[PDB]
Structure 1
């Protein structure tokens, strides 16, 4: 990964924009000018934000780079960085870098910024336990399991992601600055022990429950918990609902596809003050009852309106053959389970049988 003769910058740095970056760094007149390994060895820092760079191919010839500012470019592959053993500060905001495995051998990396990169999988960060600052805001992260190994972090931004489980943070007692706004957090117990926090942000938590059936009298557990595990009393409840601790209750005489409640809780951890504020959203399914009538005996099943009914195993009546399920007793329309949709009301389907042939 070295040049042994004078070589044009453009020959090493194949991305035309990155080549211009090196030319300017070395105070050269043209990307056709030849450079030497000694000149490449002299580069300690590259500042090339918002420079339309698609590839840093060639950077592997710069063994002594310690600081790399590459925010606002068009990068995807960062494999050319893999062996920059002295890299200490890496800023890659607003690119499309997802393959964090290229970082695994950067054991002197102290600060890593990867905001707005579309990242969901950060498991590659397990190989960087020495990190002190990590910026991952505005991504698509759900699973931060790996962060329990990053016991040297004092600054961690996970804001604007999709995180609900923050238990992996519970042991990171060195944290001083923790940005968690715009996630899916409903349970703050994981934060209780972070006694060194100076800055904490917990605004705008959007918590989505799995759908349940609509009912006239609905009950949903309050799942919002403070650092001590106690329930946060709702600030306001949709659809004229009420709080009967520990449950939220509604009377819903007409179907609606959602109820919700909002919560607000001032939080103090260490020296940090925060406002835990968010909404719990409960989707509701519009369900009615299909009654299967088999010669006067009934089995009931609940089905969501506007969906297809899954036909039951057909009845077996000694001496007869099952014909089908019909909308009237001894007559009507034969239900077609592949084309007829569940209606917006309870109704009965009647088993009709026919003679053995």
Structure 2
């Protein structure tokens, strides 16, 4: 938490690439140059996107840093951020930060970006109800329960995850930019109260029905639902099927292991327009 003698930058900051970042931030000549706690205390901002950083060890001695631009590095461990109590913006897109528990005490964090991190558990974000901006695109998330607590969010991206249940978003009325494309969403009722939306994306959903028994004359309830709960009429039905609301119907004279349908609905929420479209797969059992 502090250094008590002038100390080589390369001593404090174990990663070479991070040492080099600190040297450039402080305008030092070399990584072997002695630094003081007073100089480390002057660091408000580190911009080191795309800098091949494997570890931010030594960052613990920068008590005043409020902004970290660390996108496009190779970080796995953020425990060195745990006690940076003034952190306000933290950009970690394209790393491998999987463990979020170190964010717990960052009560000033307003903007967090963790795109493409292989994240599946975001329950540790329950400790950041003050968050206003949250990018979690391109991860492995299914359960967004904790997001119901993040009621200050005006920006949220969850595109390219494996979310079906969007109920946790319903009360998040501050949302202005919401990115939900490439999930598993069939039902938009949760989004109906988001009257402040300016930007909404709902492209390319994939829904999977629980298996049913094949029948030569198959009847399957349509489950794709607009914000008002109404069923979205399908646009293409597989295997020469047809639609008789509320049901999709197929003549399947031989067994086949699946049918499907594709849907599309232009939707308006708040001030925002989006194309909700996707497909529904119905596996069949012999």
Q: CA deviation at 1:235?
A: 1.0
- In 2, the alpha carbon distance for the partners of 1:186 and 1:225 equals 6
Q: CA deviation at 1:242?
A: 1.3
Structure 1: gaps of 5 or more residues: 285-355
Cα deviation digits, residues 66-107 of structure 1 (max 9, x gap): 110111111111000001111100000001111111001000
Q: CA deviation at 1:211?
A: 2.0
Cα deviation digits, residues 287-334 of structure 1 (max 9, x gap): xxxxxxxxxxxxxxxxxxxxxxxxxxxxxxxxxxxxxxxxxxxxxxxx
Question: Larger C-alpha radius of gyration, 1 or 2?
Answer: 1
- In 2, the alpha carbon distance for the partners of 1:281 and 1:180 equals 19
Higher-strand-fraction structure = 1
Q: CA deviation at 1:212?
A: 2.0
Cα deviation digits, residues 146-171 of structure 1 (max 9, x gap): 00000000000000110000000000
Q: Give 1:87's aligned residue.
A: 87
Map 1:69-108 → 2, pairs under 5 A? 69-108=69-108
- In 2, the alpha carbon distance for the partners of 1:53 and 1:123 equals 26
TM-score (norm 2): 0.98
SS at match of 1:235: strand
Q: Which moved more, 1:139-148 or 1:204-213?
A: 204-213
Cα deviation digits, residues 189-217 of structure 1 (max 9, x gap): 00000011111000101111122222211
Choose between structure 1 and 2 for higher RCO, CA contacts under 8 A separated by at least 6 residues. Answer: 2
Structure 2: gaps of 5 or more residues: none
- In 2, the alpha carbon distance for the partners of 1:212 and 1:14 equals 57
Q: CA deviation at 1:52?
A: 1.1
Q: Give 1:206's aligned residue.
A: 206
- In 2, the alpha carbon distance for the partners of 1:94 and 1:75 equals 9
Q: CA deviation at 1:50?
A: 1.2
- In 1, the alpha carbon distance for the partners of 2:230 and 2:97 equals 40
- In 2, the alpha carbon distance for the partners of 1:115 and 1:10 equals 30
Q: Give 2:27's aligned residue.
A: 27
Q: CA deviation at 1:244?
A: 1.6
Q: CA deviation at 1:219?
A: 1.4
Q: CA RMSD in A?
A: 3.5
- In 2, the alpha carbon distance for the partners of 1:283 and 1:30 equals 63
